[PDB]
Amino acid sequence: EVLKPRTLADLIRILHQLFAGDEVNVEEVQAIMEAYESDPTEWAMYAKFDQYRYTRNLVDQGNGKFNLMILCWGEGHGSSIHDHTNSHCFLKMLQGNLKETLFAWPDKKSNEMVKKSERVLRENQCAYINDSVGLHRVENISHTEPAVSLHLYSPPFDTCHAFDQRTGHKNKVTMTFHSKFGIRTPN
Ligand SMILES: [Fe+2]
């Protein structure tokens, strides 16, 4: 019932088709991304880690329709609470496990932020978020092993907001790439 990509390259080919116009079936994308069986022989050339923070490694630009990237989470690495500036956002596990915590949006009043959901993303599992679903923070569950995830954002975006969990106040942050197409980027 689900078209099963046999390689990362197959998955990318299918994604170019599914985002070629107008309407995106979210559950169809999610099922196809999940059906791909993570193969580190296929994506190790994008898995470039850093000691102190997670890295973002661009795989494909989707003919302007989306960004496909691989995020590398060192031991104990996690994100801040953030939004996804009005895009579709798909996140698939390639290695290890991520804990996702969904947060409610703050209002004007300064307040401790409220959790709405907490889960661990299993092996090969594909999760979905957008701004109407909530905010989230994502974290490697392991302090001894890495995590690796495949992210599709549509349309692409280069900025988002990070949120202070104690107050709900936010700051705009520019997203940078650690590498693109397997090639490390400058400082
Ligand atoms: Fe995110």
Supply the CATH number for residue 121's domain.
2.60.120.10
Question: Cβ–Cβ contacts within 10 Å for residue 68, how many?
Answer: 23
- Tell me whether strands 55-60 and 179-180 are parallel, antiparallel or unpaired: parallel
The reply, when asked if residue 136 is annotated as ligand binding, is yes
CA dihedral 160, 164, 165, 166 (to 10 degrees): -160
Query: Please, is 157 exposed, middle or buried when counting C-beta atoms within 10 Å of its C-beta (0-12, 13-18, 19+)?
Result: middle
The Å distance, Cα 136 to ligand 1 centre, comes to 6
Q: How far is the CA of 41 from the centre of ligand 1 (A)?
A: 25
Q: How many whole angstroms separate alpha carbon 14 and alpha carbon 158? A: 24
Structure tokens at 22: 């107008």
Question: Can you tell me whether residue 14 is helix, strand or coil?
Answer: helix
Task: Give the distance (Å) from ligand 1 centre to CA of residue 84.
Answer: 6
79 CA distance to ligand 1 middle (Å):
8
Strands 135-140 and 126-129: unpaired
**Distances, alpha carbon 8 to alpha carbons 38, 44, 116, 127, 183, in Å:** 8, 11, 33, 18, 18
Strands 67-73 and 81-82, sheet pairing: unpaired
Question: Is 84 annotated for ligand binding?
Answer: yes
170 Cα–ligand 1 center, Å: 15
Q: Give yes or no for a contact between 68 and 151, defined as CB atoms under 8 angstroms apart.
A: yes
Domain span at residue 138 reads: 1-187
Say if CB 93 and CB 30 are below 8 A apart.
no
Q: From ligand 1's centre to the CA of 137, what distance in Å? A: 7
Q: Is 169 annotated as a binding residue?
A: no
CA distances (Å), 28 to each of 4, 18, 152, in order?
A: 11, 9, 14
> Could you give the number of structural domains in the chain?
1
Q: What method did the depositors use to determine the structure?
A: X-ray
- Name every residue whose Cβ is closer than 8 Å to that of residue 183 and which is 6 or more positions away in sequence: none
Cα(179)–Cα(186) distance, rounded to whole angstroms? 9
> Which of 186, 150, 141 has the alpha carbon at shortest distance from 58?
150
**The CA-based dihedral angle spanning residues 119, 120, 125, 131, taken in that order and rounded to the nearest 10 degrees:** 40
Calculate how far, in angstroms, residue 83's C-alpha sits from the geometric centre of ligand 1: 7
